[PDB]
Amino acid sequence: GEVRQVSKHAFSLKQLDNPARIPPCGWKCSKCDMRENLWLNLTDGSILCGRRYFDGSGGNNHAVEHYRETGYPLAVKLGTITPDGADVYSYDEDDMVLDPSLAEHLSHFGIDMLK
Ligand SMILES: O=C(O)CCC(=O)c1ccc(S(=O)(=O)N2CCC(c3ccc(F)c(F)c3)CC2)cc1
Ligand SMILES: [Zn+2]
C-alpha cells in the first residue's frame, strides 16, 4: 500500500563502531561527483548516489551496488531529514519504510534531526 510500514530491520539494526560525523550539508557520493540524490547507509554511514531508474533518471547506482556487496539494508536520503522524519529505503524489503529508531540511528552519525 501507500503507507510506509515499519522495516523488520529497524529495531535490531547493527550500526558499526567509529561512525563518521555526517555534516548537515555539502555531501558528495564517495564513488563519483554527484552532490544530489545521496543515500546514507544507516549501518556504516557510507554516502552513495541513488539508482538509475528504468526511465534513465537518477544517479550512478553506487548505494545499490554497496547494498549488493554488504547486505546493509537501510539508507536515508540526505536532504529529506527534518524534525518530522526522513525518506528511508529498505533494499531487502524493496520499499520506502518507517524506522521507529530513526532519531537514534541518525544520532549515531552526530545528526540531530530535531535541528
Ligand atoms: O536509489 C537508491 O539506491 C535507494 C532508494 C531506492 O532504491 C528507491 C527505490 C524505489 C523508490 S519508489 O518506489 O518510492 N519510487 C520509484 C519511482 C521513482 C520515480 C522516478 C522518476 C519519476 F519520474 C517518477 F515519477 C517516479 C520515485 C520513487 C524509492 C527509492
Ligand atoms: Zn555515485
Short mmCIF file of N, CA and C and ligand atoms in Angstrom, two decimals:
data_model
loop_
_atom_site.label_atom_id
_atom_site.label_comp_id
_atom_site.label_asym_id
_atom_site.label_seq_id
_atom_site.Cartn_x
_atom_site.Cartn_y
_atom_site.Cartn_z
N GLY A 1 0.83 -1.24 0.00
CA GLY A 1 0.00 0.00 0.00
C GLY A 1 0.85 1.26 0.00
N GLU A 2 0.20 2.43 0.05
CA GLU A 2 0.83 3.79 0.03
C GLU A 2 1.56 4.08 1.36
N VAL A 3 1.02 3.64 2.51
CA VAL A 3 1.54 3.99 3.88
C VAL A 3 2.87 3.27 4.10
N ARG A 4 3.83 3.93 4.75
CA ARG A 4 5.16 3.31 4.95
C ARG A 4 5.13 2.43 6.19
N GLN A 5 5.37 1.13 6.00
CA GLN A 5 5.35 0.13 7.09
C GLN A 5 6.71 0.13 7.80
N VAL A 6 6.72 -0.32 9.06
CA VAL A 6 7.95 -0.44 9.88
C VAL A 6 8.87 -1.48 9.20
N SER A 7 10.13 -1.14 8.95
CA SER A 7 11.11 -2.13 8.44
C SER A 7 11.34 -3.20 9.50
N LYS A 8 11.45 -4.45 9.09
CA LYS A 8 11.79 -5.56 10.02
C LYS A 8 13.23 -5.40 10.54
N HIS A 9 14.05 -4.55 9.91
CA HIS A 9 15.47 -4.31 10.29
C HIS A 9 15.58 -3.19 11.32
N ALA A 10 14.54 -2.37 11.51
CA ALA A 10 14.67 -1.06 12.19
C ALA A 10 15.06 -1.29 13.66
N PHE A 11 14.38 -2.20 14.35
CA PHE A 11 14.53 -2.39 15.81
C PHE A 11 15.97 -2.82 16.13
N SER A 12 16.47 -3.82 15.41
CA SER A 12 17.71 -4.56 15.76
C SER A 12 18.89 -4.14 14.88
N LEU A 13 18.79 -3.07 14.09
CA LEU A 13 19.86 -2.68 13.12
C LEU A 13 21.19 -2.57 13.87
N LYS A 14 22.23 -3.26 13.43
CA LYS A 14 23.59 -3.09 13.99
C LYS A 14 24.27 -1.95 13.23
N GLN A 15 24.65 -0.90 13.95
CA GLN A 15 25.43 0.22 13.40
C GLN A 15 26.86 0.01 13.85
N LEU A 16 27.79 0.14 12.91
CA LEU A 16 29.23 -0.15 13.14
C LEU A 16 29.79 0.94 14.05
N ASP A 17 30.82 0.58 14.83
CA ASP A 17 31.57 1.47 15.74
C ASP A 17 32.40 2.48 14.94
N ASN A 18 32.79 3.57 15.59
CA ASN A 18 33.65 4.62 14.97
C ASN A 18 32.97 5.20 13.73
N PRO A 19 31.68 5.59 13.81
CA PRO A 19 31.00 6.22 12.70
C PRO A 19 31.60 7.59 12.37
N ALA A 20 31.52 7.99 11.10
CA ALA A 20 31.81 9.37 10.66
C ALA A 20 30.81 10.29 11.34
N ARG A 21 31.20 11.55 11.53
CA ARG A 21 30.29 12.68 11.81
C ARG A 21 29.78 13.21 10.47
N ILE A 22 28.52 12.98 10.17
CA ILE A 22 27.87 13.38 8.89
C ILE A 22 27.44 14.83 9.02
N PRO A 23 27.90 15.75 8.14
CA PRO A 23 27.56 17.17 8.27
C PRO A 23 26.12 17.43 7.87
N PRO A 24 25.58 18.63 8.17
CA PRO A 24 24.20 18.96 7.83
C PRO A 24 23.99 19.31 6.34
N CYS A 25 25.06 19.41 5.57
CA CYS A 25 25.01 19.73 4.12
C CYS A 25 26.36 19.43 3.47
N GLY A 26 26.43 19.59 2.15
CA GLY A 26 27.69 19.69 1.39
C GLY A 26 28.24 18.33 0.98
N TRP A 27 27.42 17.28 1.02
CA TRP A 27 27.87 15.87 0.84
C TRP A 27 28.20 15.62 -0.64
N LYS A 28 29.05 14.62 -0.89
CA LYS A 28 29.32 14.04 -2.22
C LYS A 28 29.20 12.51 -2.13
N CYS A 29 28.78 11.86 -3.22
CA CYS A 29 28.97 10.41 -3.41
C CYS A 29 30.47 10.10 -3.28
N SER A 30 30.84 9.13 -2.46
CA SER A 30 32.26 8.78 -2.25
C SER A 30 32.82 8.07 -3.50
N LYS A 31 31.97 7.70 -4.48
CA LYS A 31 32.40 6.92 -5.67
C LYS A 31 32.32 7.76 -6.94
N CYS A 32 31.67 8.91 -6.94
CA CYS A 32 31.55 9.76 -8.16
C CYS A 32 31.28 11.22 -7.76
N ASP A 33 30.98 12.09 -8.72
CA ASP A 33 30.95 13.56 -8.49
C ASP A 33 29.56 14.04 -8.03
N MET A 34 28.59 13.14 -7.87
CA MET A 34 27.19 13.57 -7.59
C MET A 34 27.11 14.21 -6.19
N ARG A 35 26.43 15.35 -6.12
CA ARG A 35 26.19 16.14 -4.88
C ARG A 35 24.69 16.22 -4.59
N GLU A 36 23.88 15.53 -5.38
CA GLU A 36 22.44 15.40 -5.08
C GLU A 36 22.06 13.91 -5.15
N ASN A 37 20.87 13.56 -4.68
CA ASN A 37 20.37 12.17 -4.71
C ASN A 37 21.37 11.23 -4.00
N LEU A 38 21.76 11.59 -2.78
CA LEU A 38 22.74 10.83 -1.96
C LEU A 38 22.05 10.11 -0.80
N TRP A 39 22.43 8.86 -0.58
CA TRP A 39 21.81 7.97 0.43
C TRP A 39 22.86 7.57 1.46
N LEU A 40 22.55 7.83 2.72
CA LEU A 40 23.37 7.47 3.88
C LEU A 40 22.95 6.08 4.32
N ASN A 41 23.81 5.09 4.16
CA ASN A 41 23.54 3.75 4.71
C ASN A 41 23.63 3.82 6.24
N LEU A 42 22.57 3.40 6.94
CA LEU A 42 22.44 3.54 8.41
C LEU A 42 23.35 2.54 9.15
N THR A 43 23.85 1.48 8.50
CA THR A 43 24.80 0.54 9.15
C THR A 43 26.18 1.19 9.22
N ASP A 44 26.69 1.73 8.12
CA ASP A 44 28.13 2.07 8.00
C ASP A 44 28.35 3.55 7.67
N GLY A 45 27.32 4.35 7.51
CA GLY A 45 27.48 5.79 7.24
C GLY A 45 28.13 6.09 5.90
N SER A 46 28.12 5.14 4.94
CA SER A 46 28.54 5.41 3.54
C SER A 46 27.54 6.38 2.91
N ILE A 47 28.03 7.32 2.11
CA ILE A 47 27.21 8.29 1.36
C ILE A 47 27.43 7.99 -0.11
N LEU A 48 26.39 7.50 -0.78
CA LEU A 48 26.49 6.97 -2.17
C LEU A 48 25.23 7.37 -2.95
N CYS A 49 25.35 7.49 -4.25
CA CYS A 49 24.25 8.03 -5.09
C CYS A 49 23.15 6.98 -5.33
N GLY A 50 21.96 7.48 -5.58
CA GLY A 50 20.75 6.70 -5.85
C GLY A 50 20.84 6.01 -7.19
N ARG A 51 19.93 5.09 -7.41
CA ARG A 51 19.95 4.23 -8.59
C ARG A 51 19.50 4.98 -9.86
N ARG A 52 19.89 4.44 -11.00
CA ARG A 52 19.34 4.78 -12.33
C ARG A 52 18.02 4.04 -12.49
N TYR A 53 16.92 4.76 -12.50
CA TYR A 53 15.57 4.23 -12.80
C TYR A 53 15.50 3.85 -14.30
N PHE A 54 14.51 3.04 -14.64
CA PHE A 54 14.38 2.45 -16.00
C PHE A 54 13.94 3.52 -16.99
N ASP A 55 13.60 4.73 -16.52
CA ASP A 55 13.35 5.89 -17.41
C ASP A 55 14.67 6.61 -17.71
N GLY A 56 15.78 6.24 -17.06
CA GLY A 56 17.11 6.88 -17.23
C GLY A 56 17.33 8.08 -16.32
N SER A 57 16.34 8.46 -15.50
CA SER A 57 16.53 9.44 -14.39
C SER A 57 17.29 8.76 -13.24
N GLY A 58 17.83 9.58 -12.32
CA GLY A 58 18.51 9.12 -11.09
C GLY A 58 20.02 9.16 -11.22
N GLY A 59 20.71 8.45 -10.32
CA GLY A 59 22.17 8.54 -10.13
C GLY A 59 22.91 7.38 -10.77
N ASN A 60 24.06 7.01 -10.22
CA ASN A 60 25.02 6.06 -10.84
C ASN A 60 25.05 4.73 -10.07
N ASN A 61 23.98 4.41 -9.31
CA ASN A 61 23.75 3.08 -8.69
C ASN A 61 24.73 2.77 -7.55
N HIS A 62 25.45 3.75 -7.02
CA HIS A 62 26.56 3.46 -6.07
C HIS A 62 25.99 2.92 -4.74
N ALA A 63 24.86 3.44 -4.25
CA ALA A 63 24.25 2.98 -2.99
C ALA A 63 23.71 1.55 -3.19
N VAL A 64 23.11 1.24 -4.34
CA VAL A 64 22.55 -0.13 -4.57
C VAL A 64 23.69 -1.13 -4.74
N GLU A 65 24.75 -0.78 -5.47
CA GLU A 65 25.95 -1.64 -5.60
C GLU A 65 26.54 -1.91 -4.22
N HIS A 66 26.57 -0.91 -3.34
CA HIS A 66 27.10 -1.07 -1.97
C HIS A 66 26.21 -2.04 -1.18
N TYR A 67 24.89 -1.94 -1.31
CA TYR A 67 23.94 -2.90 -0.71
C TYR A 67 24.26 -4.33 -1.19
N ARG A 68 24.42 -4.52 -2.49
CA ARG A 68 24.66 -5.88 -3.05
C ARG A 68 25.94 -6.47 -2.41
N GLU A 69 26.98 -5.66 -2.20
CA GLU A 69 28.25 -6.14 -1.59
C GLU A 69 28.10 -6.38 -0.07
N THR A 70 27.30 -5.60 0.67
CA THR A 70 27.34 -5.59 2.16
C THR A 70 26.12 -6.27 2.76
N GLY A 71 24.98 -6.23 2.08
CA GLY A 71 23.69 -6.67 2.62
C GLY A 71 23.12 -5.68 3.63
N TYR A 72 23.68 -4.48 3.75
CA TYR A 72 23.24 -3.44 4.72
C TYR A 72 21.97 -2.78 4.19
N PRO A 73 20.80 -3.04 4.81
CA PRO A 73 19.52 -2.82 4.14
C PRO A 73 18.90 -1.41 4.16
N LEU A 74 19.19 -0.60 5.18
CA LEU A 74 18.51 0.69 5.40
C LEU A 74 19.41 1.84 4.96
N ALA A 75 18.86 2.77 4.20
CA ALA A 75 19.53 4.02 3.81
C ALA A 75 18.55 5.18 3.94
N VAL A 76 19.06 6.38 4.26
CA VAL A 76 18.25 7.61 4.38
C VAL A 76 18.73 8.61 3.33
N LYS A 77 17.79 9.24 2.64
CA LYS A 77 18.11 10.21 1.59
C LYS A 77 18.49 11.52 2.26
N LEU A 78 19.74 11.90 2.08
CA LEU A 78 20.28 13.16 2.62
C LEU A 78 19.54 14.32 1.96
N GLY A 79 19.17 15.34 2.75
CA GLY A 79 18.31 16.46 2.31
C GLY A 79 16.83 16.24 2.61
N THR A 80 16.40 15.05 3.07
CA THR A 80 14.97 14.78 3.41
C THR A 80 14.79 14.68 4.93
N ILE A 81 15.87 14.81 5.69
CA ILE A 81 15.81 14.67 7.17
C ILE A 81 15.25 15.97 7.73
N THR A 82 14.13 15.90 8.43
CA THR A 82 13.54 17.04 9.16
C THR A 82 13.20 16.59 10.57
N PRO A 83 12.67 17.49 11.43
CA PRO A 83 12.11 17.10 12.72
C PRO A 83 10.98 16.06 12.64
N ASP A 84 10.36 15.89 11.48
CA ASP A 84 9.15 15.02 11.33
C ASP A 84 9.51 13.67 10.72
N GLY A 85 10.78 13.45 10.37
CA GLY A 85 11.27 12.16 9.85
C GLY A 85 12.21 12.33 8.68
N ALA A 86 12.15 11.42 7.72
CA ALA A 86 13.06 11.36 6.56
C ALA A 86 12.56 10.32 5.57
N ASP A 87 13.11 10.35 4.35
CA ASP A 87 12.89 9.27 3.36
C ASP A 87 13.86 8.14 3.68
N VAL A 88 13.33 6.99 4.10
CA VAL A 88 14.14 5.78 4.43
C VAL A 88 13.73 4.64 3.49
N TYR A 89 14.73 4.03 2.83
CA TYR A 89 14.54 2.90 1.90
C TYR A 89 15.16 1.63 2.48
N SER A 90 14.46 0.51 2.33
CA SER A 90 14.96 -0.85 2.62
C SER A 90 15.22 -1.58 1.30
N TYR A 91 16.48 -1.87 0.98
CA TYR A 91 16.86 -2.60 -0.25
C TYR A 91 16.29 -4.02 -0.18
N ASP A 92 16.33 -4.60 1.01
CA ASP A 92 15.93 -6.00 1.31
C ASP A 92 14.42 -6.16 1.11
N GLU A 93 13.63 -5.25 1.67
CA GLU A 93 12.14 -5.27 1.57
C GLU A 93 11.71 -4.58 0.27
N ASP A 94 12.62 -3.84 -0.37
CA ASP A 94 12.38 -3.14 -1.67
C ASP A 94 11.17 -2.20 -1.53
N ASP A 95 11.28 -1.22 -0.64
CA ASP A 95 10.19 -0.28 -0.28
C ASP A 95 10.76 0.87 0.54
N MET A 96 10.16 2.05 0.42
CA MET A 96 10.24 3.12 1.43
C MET A 96 9.62 2.55 2.71
N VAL A 97 10.25 2.81 3.86
CA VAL A 97 9.86 2.19 5.16
C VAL A 97 9.92 3.24 6.24
N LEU A 98 9.33 2.89 7.38
CA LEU A 98 9.40 3.65 8.65
C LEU A 98 10.46 3.00 9.52
N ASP A 99 11.36 3.81 10.04
CA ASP A 99 12.37 3.39 11.03
C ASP A 99 11.99 4.07 12.35
N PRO A 100 11.28 3.37 13.26
CA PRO A 100 10.88 3.96 14.55
C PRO A 100 12.09 4.40 15.39
N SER A 101 13.27 3.87 15.09
CA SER A 101 14.53 4.19 15.80
C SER A 101 15.36 5.17 14.99
N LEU A 102 14.74 5.94 14.08
CA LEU A 102 15.46 6.86 13.16
C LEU A 102 16.29 7.85 13.98
N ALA A 103 15.71 8.46 15.02
CA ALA A 103 16.41 9.51 15.81
C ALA A 103 17.73 8.94 16.38
N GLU A 104 17.69 7.73 16.94
CA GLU A 104 18.89 7.04 17.47
C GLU A 104 19.85 6.72 16.32
N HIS A 105 19.33 6.22 15.19
CA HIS A 105 20.20 5.77 14.07
C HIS A 105 20.93 6.97 13.47
N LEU A 106 20.28 8.14 13.41
CA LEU A 106 20.90 9.39 12.92
C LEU A 106 21.85 9.97 13.98
N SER A 107 21.48 9.92 15.26
CA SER A 107 22.32 10.41 16.39
C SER A 107 23.68 9.67 16.39
N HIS A 108 23.68 8.39 16.01
CA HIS A 108 24.91 7.58 15.79
C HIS A 108 25.92 8.33 14.90
N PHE A 109 25.47 9.11 13.91
CA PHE A 109 26.36 9.81 12.94
C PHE A 109 26.50 11.29 13.30
N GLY A 110 26.06 11.65 14.51
CA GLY A 110 26.05 13.03 15.03
C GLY A 110 25.03 13.91 14.33
N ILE A 111 23.96 13.32 13.77
CA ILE A 111 22.85 14.08 13.11
C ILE A 111 21.74 14.28 14.15
N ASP A 112 21.41 15.54 14.44
CA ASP A 112 20.25 15.95 15.28
C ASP A 112 19.11 16.32 14.34
N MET A 113 18.15 15.43 14.13
CA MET A 113 17.09 15.68 13.12
C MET A 113 16.24 16.86 13.64
N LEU A 114 15.95 16.87 14.96
CA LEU A 114 15.18 17.92 15.70
C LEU A 114 15.68 19.32 15.31
N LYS A 115 16.96 19.44 14.92
CA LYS A 115 17.57 20.71 14.44
C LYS A 115 17.45 20.77 12.91
O1 LIG B 1 18.36 4.74 -5.07
C1 LIG B 1 18.73 4.09 -4.09
O2 LIG B 1 19.85 3.44 -4.05
C2 LIG B 1 17.96 3.98 -2.80
C3 LIG B 1 16.49 4.35 -2.95
C4 LIG B 1 15.73 3.37 -3.81
O3 LIG B 1 16.29 2.38 -4.25
C5 LIG B 1 14.30 3.65 -4.14
C6 LIG B 1 13.59 2.79 -4.97
C7 LIG B 1 12.24 2.99 -5.22
C8 LIG B 1 11.59 4.07 -4.64
S1 LIG B 1 9.91 4.38 -5.02
O4 LIG B 1 9.27 3.15 -5.37
O5 LIG B 1 9.38 5.18 -3.96
N1 LIG B 1 9.88 5.33 -6.36
C9 LIG B 1 10.28 4.69 -7.62
C10 LIG B 1 9.91 5.56 -8.81
C11 LIG B 1 10.52 6.94 -8.67
C12 LIG B 1 10.25 7.83 -9.87
C13 LIG B 1 11.28 8.18 -10.73
C14 LIG B 1 11.08 9.09 -11.76
C15 LIG B 1 9.82 9.63 -11.93
F1 LIG B 1 9.58 10.48 -12.96
C16 LIG B 1 8.80 9.28 -11.10
F2 LIG B 1 7.57 9.79 -11.34
C17 LIG B 1 8.99 8.39 -10.07
C18 LIG B 1 10.07 7.56 -7.35
C19 LIG B 1 10.46 6.67 -6.18
C20 LIG B 1 12.28 4.93 -3.79
C21 LIG B 1 13.63 4.74 -3.57
ZN ZN B 2 27.97 7.79 -7.17
#
